[PDB]
Write a protein that binds this DNA or RNA. Structure first.
Lengths: 226, 58, 118
RNA sequence: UGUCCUACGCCGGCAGGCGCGGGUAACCCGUUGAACCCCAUUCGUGAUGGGGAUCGGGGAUUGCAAUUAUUCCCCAUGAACGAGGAAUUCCCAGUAAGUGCGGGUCAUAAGCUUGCGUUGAUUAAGUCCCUGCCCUUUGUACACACCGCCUCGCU
């Protein structure tokens, strides 16, 4: 968490390209889960940070709860006067909500973070499995979760997909602009549910004997046989 | 040189997924039509929606 | 903190799962923040609310004036929906504490974010 | 390194002008009076006498030409900046790092690369855990392959 002190939070709010792109994958993520129109649903925001994706969710009428570990992200989110509620915690220890709670889940650039072992007590696979199991717990049955990432290799992808398919989630991932570089995004979307004579001439060639040249009329019926 | 690097790292990701699949079956239970031949990029198609690629999870 | 948020909150401790709910409350600063009133959200999500937990939570927050039964309808009763909107979505616990019933660990609501760290 | 390096004298608070000499070089710049460092004063935990950008005015120099500031000097303003979360860069002794000084590019920049000297540290004499490279064995492992299991509903 110690990146996002007051200085880096002040950087994060003062970045036009970053705000624009977070709004773009926030819109794409909200489009990617098929929540019904004119039904205000209840969502879980992961990697809310300053609440840019949370601000987009509040703009569309949906209600959301943000979860983060950096204090300056939540402080600047309060300073931005967001409408949703904030919670200060890590996904790797488990999301502390009842079963059948969230109608949808949106994670924005928050899932590639748990793929490496940084402390001696830490373990990436078990933390990711706990995170996915807690997602499967707190989500309502029949909901959908969209999880945005920028994988630096396929090791992170295989660990994330194994821990996702081991916690009971079903789905896949969709890549936006796979052939592009600037627009390539990863969205893990999960939810709680004549030939014969040719061969013979080749055979005679491997047996090393003289063969006729192979031409157009190789296998051709001469005439009807009565 | 960089084109071959892109091709080999994409092949490495694909083979790593295809080797992820068998232990996923054991212990448990991509944009080809969007290629642009003339140059690197992404061109819209009329019959299909905006470019994407879905690889479902097992 | 919105009333509904703690009303759906649990404890992330491994041992107490999944029976760490409901959380016991404490408030020293209560504010009112306006929220747009969409009656579809309330009408759909009252059946999602555990009413015994809601009553004991209101009793923890010194507050008694709530309907005692599940208010189900077609968004025709403006008074009940408006009052529950004020309680759940507009009454905000700016400062306070949350104690876990099955473990005893306390999370400080400090303007206005509770902590969920080890 | 030097026919542009400059000693010395005068003027201007400074960038800079004037005059007179040495040097085709271990001879003159040059006993290369450098910067870090030491001593003494003030400041005092304060986006502050820290930090310098971005600005306004004036002067001078280099050039045919300085406007979108070539460059320097002086005054007026003190923005961000509170040790920086998840890719990693270099390194085992006069070494890293701090610190200044030369050559090449150059009618004038200061910014790139090469070296040079001064003060001078922590850890280690280990390993294949990762990465990259070079070997030996093997086609036993996975995969391909074997075999099994391999759509319904009227006349």
């Amino acid at each position: 968490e110690l990146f996002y002190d007051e200085t880096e939070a002040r950087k994060y709010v003062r970045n036009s390209r970053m705000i624009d792109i977070q709004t773009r994958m926030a819109g794409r993520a909200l489009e990617l889960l098929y929540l019904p129109e004119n039904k205000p649903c209840y969502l879980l925001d992961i990697g809310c940070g300053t609440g840019l994706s949370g601000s987009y969710l509040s703009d569309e009428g949906h209600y959301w709860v943000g979860l983060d570990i950096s204090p300056a992200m939540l402080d600047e989110a309060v300073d931005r006067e967001i409408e949703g509620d904030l919670l200060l915690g890590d996904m790797g220890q488990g999301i502390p909500f009842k079963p059948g709670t969230f109608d949808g889940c949106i994670s924005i650039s928050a899932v590639q973070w748990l793929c490496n072992a940084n402390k001696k007590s830490e373990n990436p696979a078990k933390r990711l499995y706990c995170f996915f199991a807690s997602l499967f717990s707190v989500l309502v049955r029949g909901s959908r979760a969209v999880l945005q990432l920028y994988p630096e290799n396929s090791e992170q992808l295989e660990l994330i997909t194994t821990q996702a398919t081991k916690a009971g989630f079903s789905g896949g991932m969709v890549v936006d602009y796979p052939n592009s570089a600037k627009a390539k995004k990863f969205y893990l979307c999960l939810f709680s549910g004549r030939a014969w004579v040719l061969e013979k001439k080749e055979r005679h060639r491997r047996q090393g004997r003289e063969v006729r040249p192979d031409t157009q009329y190789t296998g051709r019926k001469r005439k009807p046989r009565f | 040189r960089n084109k071959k690097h892109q091709k080999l790292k994409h092949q490495k990701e694909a083979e790593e997924e295809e080797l992820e699949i068998p232990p996923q079956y054991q212990a448990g239970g991509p944009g080809a039509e969007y290629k642009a031949k003339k140059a690197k990029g992404d061109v819209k198609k009329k019959g299909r929606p905006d470019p994407y690629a879905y690889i479902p999870l097992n | 903190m919105k009333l509904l948020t703690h009303n759906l909150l649990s404890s992330h401790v491994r041992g107490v799962g999944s029976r760490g709910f409901p959380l016991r409350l404490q408030a020293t600063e209560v504010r009112i923040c306006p929220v747009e009133f969409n009656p579809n959200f309330v009408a759909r999500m009252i059946p999602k609310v555990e009413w015994s937990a809601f009553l004991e939570a209101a009793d923890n927050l010194r507050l008694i004036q709530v309907p005692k039964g599940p208010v189900e309808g077609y968004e025709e009763n403006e008074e009940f929906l408006r009052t529950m909107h004020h309680l759940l979505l507009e009454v905000e616990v700016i400062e306070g504490t949350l104690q876990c019933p099955e473990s005893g660990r306390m999370f400080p609501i400090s303007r206005g974010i509770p902590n969920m760290l080890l």
